[PDB]
Design a protein around this ligand. Structure first.
Ligand SMILES: CC(=O)N[C@@H]1[C@@H](O)[C@H](O[C@@H]2O[C@H](CO)[C@@H](O)[C@H](O)[C@H]2NC(C)=O)[C@@H](CO)O[C@H]1O
Ligand SMILES: CC(=O)N[C@@H]1[C@@H](O)[C@H](O[C@@H]2O[C@H](CO)[C@@H](O)[C@H](O)[C@H]2NC(C)=O)[C@@H](CO)O[C@H]1O
Lengths: 171, 171, 171, 171
């Protein structure tokens, strides 16, 4: 029960996450959505993507010393959206200029020479629909590539190729 | 006009479904939703579930000669809703006194003992939530067991026990 | 077999009821009978009543989104009985407790400061008699006021005084 | 600042309510509010309204055999809100469909041809402002009239005209 019509998101308690310790709230409603890629290993089953989720967070919490996984939501090629910082805890995904104003969703994999399956792309768009529904994202929300906001290779040629197809993508 | 937000469903093309030969339409909106199980093998990978989808559909087409798989939607333990007949077409699943007035979603597997994993229950609760959003189901919608409308074990002793706690389950 | 001899009811067809989508049945013999009133306007002709019967049902199915009018029978000042859900389908007129165990007859008017015409009382008293003969009501059924089971003013002050007089009434 | 800063609710002890027998729980934040009316006599002193609260309660507890007064809150024309079963206990006020997902507030009296005093209306909204401040009511909550969800004249033509004016009033 994470309020009406939210396209099946895996809760932290399910992917065996560690307790978040982030105190910063995000000023709703949010205008931007930054799509990125973990550039880490990819997964196609929920079982493997639960393990892969943990991997991203432990690296952010134990090693990098941040309060929680830097992303608001992680997407698996298993076609499921994983909950990280969520719609309210401000993310750590695109630097100081963008972190307090945009939501950050990342695709679990390295998408330079590899494309994400339709189910994952479907789940991401479906996640943004629930966003508007909850009142976290503005009906008029703008989707920006990670390259668009920071000098980075992410989300990867192939995935950056497809998010331009997305209707809400702004130049 | 009125779809607030829906949910992610695997299209027929993706699980490689045969062409539907059905033409009878369900009068819109629908008031009843019948939950049942396929009493067959379960799956937890998006790959194997797309395959399990074909099996149920082929047994219904090539062996029982029905115009398409009997259920409107299929639910996998991979946490994904698979498209069957959909929101618009009538689908043989619980008797002629009930097939013209109800949507039929079916969990893929036999849940006499075994319970469906949380993500499967989330997939179905979200599906129904999308139904209301699309206006395919009315906000009054009543969830019913397959055993509540014809003599069968169908929902599965333990899955029947679970759907009884759902907000919309009427006597 | 000993022709029950009590049918003097206007059928759904005759007063032009919209189709019922209700399918949950009562178990006969039925023990209780709950008398309520519409608190709407009253009718005294078979013509004006066929209109009122339609209105109550409309307010029930179109505004509240109910499967059909909530009462089992409606009594009019025309001296005739109107079929609602009938002797078999479970009504919606007294809550989760009584609805499964009683028939809900309702006088079509506001009897807070009025008395229903003799012919209307006769049709009511008669209806119940029909009940026993068909076997839908127990030979020793219990009549009850609507306010006896719900916090309401039904069946109206003066009419409530009338039923406490009846022989099958029970505190 | 921003603490609870809630209104002033007369607690049960102060109006000497009988002990609550209820155990069912509402799951906050609540989305709906159903405005009703006791349909009885009104009051304009903290002394007479405390009296009224008891009649309504006793009738609901010993006549109908309920676990506590049906409403969550009772508004008085004295300008004071009288605590019913509160913000956390499921109340009986609008059928098995709404009771679990809504809070029940009742204006003490009958308002068919009588408008409640400004006081009452302010106390009623103060309670709603309070509700959201405590996380009891969902911020984008909705207000419906009693007649909007059940066959009844309640809350009374005039009070109904008043609540249809409110923001949060929907369909
Ligand atoms: C021209 C240049 O210097 N490019 C830099 C990138 O090589 C460098 O690596 C990218 O960093 C991402 C975030 O740390 C990695 O996830 C990603 O795998 C990596 N890109 C690739 C595909 O090699 C980024 C660091 O962000 O900075 C660029 O400036
Ligand atoms: C090789 C294999 O795993 N076969 C699976 C079947 O055993 C399994 O059962 C069949 O399912 C139908 C639809 O649910 C049933 O109606 C049918 O009785 C049953 N087949 C029989 C005769 O046992 C199906 C599930 O569809 O999947 C196959 O993959």
């Amino acid at each position: 029960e994470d309020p009406p019509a939210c396209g099946s998101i895996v809760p932290r308690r399910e992917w065996r996450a560690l307790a978040s310790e982030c105190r910063e709230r995000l000023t709703r409603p949010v205008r931007y959505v930054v799509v990125s890629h973990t550039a880490g290993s990819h997964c196609d089953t929920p079982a493997s993507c639960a393990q892969q989720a943990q991997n991203v967070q432990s690296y952010h919490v134990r090693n990098l010393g941040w309060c929680d996984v830097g992303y608001n939501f992680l997407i698996g090629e298993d076609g499921l959206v994983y909950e990280g910082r969520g719609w309210n805890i401000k993310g750590a995904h695109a630097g100081p200029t963008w972190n307090p104003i945009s939501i950050g969703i990342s695709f679990m994999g390295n998408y330079m020479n590899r494309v994400p399956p339709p189910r994952a792309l479907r789940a991401a768009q479906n996640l943004l629909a629930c966003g508007v529904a909850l009142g976290a994202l503005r009906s008029n929300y703008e989707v920006k590539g990670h390259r668009d906001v920071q000098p980075t290779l992410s989300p990867g040629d192939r995935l950056y190729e497809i998010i331009q197809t997305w209707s809400h993508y702004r130049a």
